[PDB]
Amino acid sequence: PGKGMKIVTSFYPIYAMVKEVSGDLNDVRMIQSSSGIHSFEPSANDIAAIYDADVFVYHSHTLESWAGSLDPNLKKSKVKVLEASEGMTLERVPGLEDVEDEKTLYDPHTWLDPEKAGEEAQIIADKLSEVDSEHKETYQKNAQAFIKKAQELTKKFQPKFEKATQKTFVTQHTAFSYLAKRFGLNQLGIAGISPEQEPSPRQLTEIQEFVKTYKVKTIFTESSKVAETLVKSTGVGLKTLNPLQSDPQNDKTYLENLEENMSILAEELK
Ligand SMILES: [Cl-]
Ligand SMILES: [Zn+2]
Ligand SMILES: [Zn+2]
Ligand SMILES: [Zn+2]
Ligand SMILES: [Zn+2]
Ligand SMILES: [Zn+2]
Ligand SMILES: [Zn+2]
Ligand SMILES: [Zn+2]
Ligand SMILES: [Zn+2]
Ligand SMILES: [Zn+2]
Ligand SMILES: [Zn+2]
């Protein structure tokens, strides 16, 4: 290897965690997934790049289902496909919890919990240390340093959330379910598990009733149009909250961007 293993990642959380666990060791790139990860269909060029790589890392078969149809053996490729969330426990989708198509029941937005981002980093560090065992002492040392700062960041917002008077927030899509359950909050998504799941009229009426009931002052959006109409019917305000679905394109690391989003959330819920 020149620079190292040529690793390709699914989207921004996986890219950031692989780049921080690997450190200055390997050449890590990610396919262009700015346009939605839930409604992302890869091109032939991206698939050819994945087959010409050493390691491909994706989050879960519940998010990037197109990574399951990948078959490296029949295409004479040596790429090692790694599921970064193998072994993790996925909670039920809000609104489908007592349901018993089976991929729809589990929420894949598990990288926004600071603690479950840390679990993903350990799994990547172990998996990359089965694939390139010689540099394993570094994959763990860097994985162990990220979990500590994620643990350092989770015991810091615990008290801020603990003293919040309002524990309910509404978001453009249902992505903050794990983060909300982490700090004892109650969230409601307008578009649900996927931004292409626009609400039904009855669901829209129930969302209006919910905003009026729990005195939700602001609606967190992403940088959808239906979310931009409830401001009239409810009188709420529009504040930004990035679910880190894509690259923020700045100098901060992953946990720093997560810290910024949590800080916005904590300053609003007071
Ligand atoms: Cl998302
Ligand atoms: Zn299509
Ligand atoms: Zn799987
Ligand atoms: Zn496995
Ligand atoms: Zn239940
Ligand atoms: Zn190596
Ligand atoms: Zn080395
Ligand atoms: Zn406490
Ligand atoms: Zn989402
Ligand atoms: Zn009702
Ligand atoms: Zn910090």
Side-chain angles (χ1 to χ4, degrees), residues 12 16 20 113-115 117-118 145-151 153 244 252-262:
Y12 175 69
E20 290 175 14
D113 190 336
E115 296 244 272
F146 163 127
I147 306 208
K148 293 179 179 179
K149 184 113 180 175
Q151 248 159 39
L153 164 60
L244 304 178
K252 290 189 169 186
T253 70
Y254 177 76
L255 283 173
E256 295 174 0
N257 282 318
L258 179 57
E259 197 192 340
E260 183 195 345
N261 278 276
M262 296 164 62

Side-chain angles (χ1 to χ4, degrees), residues 20-76:
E20 290 175 14
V21 167
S22 199
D24 43 48
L25 255 183
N26 316 110
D27 171 62
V28 175
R29 313 184 144 260
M30 79 159 143
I31 51 215
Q32 186 173 355
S33 36
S34 57
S35 90
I37 172 88
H38 325 294
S39 45
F40 167 89
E41 274 159 298
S43 65
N45 299 5
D46 311 353
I47 296 176
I50 290 178
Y51 278 121
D52 288 304
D54 300 333
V55 167
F56 174 59
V57 198
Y58 68 101
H59 187 43
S60 199
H61 54 255
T62 83
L63 176 62
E64 315 103 323
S65 309
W66 53 268
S69 67
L70 293 186
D71 209 334
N73 204 273
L74 42 75
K75 250 165 169 142
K76 183 178 179 180

